[PDB]
Write a protein that binds this ligand. Sequence first.
Ligand code: FPS
Length: 512
Amino acid sequence: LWDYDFLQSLGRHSSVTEEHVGLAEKLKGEVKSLITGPMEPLAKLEFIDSVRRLGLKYQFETEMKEALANISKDGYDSWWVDNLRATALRFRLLRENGIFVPQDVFERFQNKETGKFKNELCEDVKGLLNLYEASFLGWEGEDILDEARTFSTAQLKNVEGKISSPNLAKIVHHALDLPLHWRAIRYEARWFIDIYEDEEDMNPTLLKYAKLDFNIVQSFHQAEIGRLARWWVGTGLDKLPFARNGLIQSYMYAIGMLFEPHLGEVREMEAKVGALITTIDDVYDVYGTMEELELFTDITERWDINRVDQLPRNIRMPLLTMFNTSNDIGYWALKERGFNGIPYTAKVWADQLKSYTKEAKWFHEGHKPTLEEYLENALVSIGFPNLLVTSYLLTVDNPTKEKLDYVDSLPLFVRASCILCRIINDLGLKSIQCYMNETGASQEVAREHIEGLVRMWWKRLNKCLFEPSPFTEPFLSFTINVVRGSHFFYQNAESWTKNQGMSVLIHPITLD
Ligand SMILES: CC(C)=CCC/C(C)=C/CC/C(C)=C/CSP(=O)(O)OP(=O)(O)O
């Protein structure tokens, strides 16, 4: 996975035929019919959840929303009322699909005195699991869902080792590591294909479609990786001391942000930006002198490369690649979207290098920022304002200066995502140490505080998605999915990473 000879040859061929593609068109039609067609409502919720978890929401979003809307406007509730598993699955799938369900659907499962969940639930594994997964769709002040999380976490930890079904035990272990709401879609799809195949409820048409679609999508990723590896070797940044494997790390993160084939060009551009972010992060952290870094920053602020030959080669090359790629991406927006994006790529790079320079000056002067002071800068230095403003530039319908100026100002929805990506990275001049310095907290207490900030910012993202937004798809999804990418990659670590890379990007799923 780390060999550019091997990567640069990916895309050359694929074992995905026109026969595979026709078969895929036929299976898609039956799955679409299964989602729209008759089924008992609990079975339909479980089917739609399986479609999502197999990575296929992008193929059936309209059918799934229509089916859930039907179910939501029912009037007949006997199928779910008094059933924890049914109540919790309904609550989750409706909230995920923009249909509001109040937290009070769970009040009947509580002790009316203490507000604690009933002891009699402690044995219901599938109920606890659905309640756990449901809890992460909660908003600020939804106290029943905060209790549901703490209760279902404690109970699932308790019962995990008591489960008889191996498949169910693996699912519970997976959930305790990360809830489904926090998992990167493409990576979870590869994991869940093998789990689903072993489920007793398993639908073989849906399994077969999931394997075939997985392989077809993966052939697009392999062509992208080819083009990106050839680009990267073209830049000569593969040969620089630092950011060993930056390209493939960037691309693997990009796949968490957006995996769909129709977003290939956008994904390649995000991946280039990410490769440069990680490369230049090393320049500012390890390699450059303060004078070199100040010049790098000043050149970028003025978007004026007159003085670039004052920098040494190993710094000039990253700078000019950043400049050239930013111009290319802004130009793509002009050619493809009618809107010159260079002012916006130049601006987010200037902002990011300013945030690196501030970190470098803090380090050099031995400054201890407050957690708030650190995060105000570190939500920029993490690179997600740069990555998200770029993704908006490339995907927004009818781009305008007004629209770009708004997204670039980092309203709550966007800022929440950036802060989350930063604090998740730090949990993986750092969040925990800053909070320790500010309050005298222990590492253990400081870590729990930062963890509570993750849960808080997630509740704000969740609520922002039920609110009318000036944003549309795919940007709404990008903002959530960069956070999932962060969770996934900040839980050998390199053996785990390579397996993820090999199973998701390199090896097709065996079809019979
Ligand atoms: C979504 C997408 C298109 C790609 C994202 C690309 C990447 C890799 C972005 C994350 C930024 C990182 C990991 C830089 C170091 S964080 P740090 O400086 O706090 O940590 P360090 O001290 O360098 O380990």
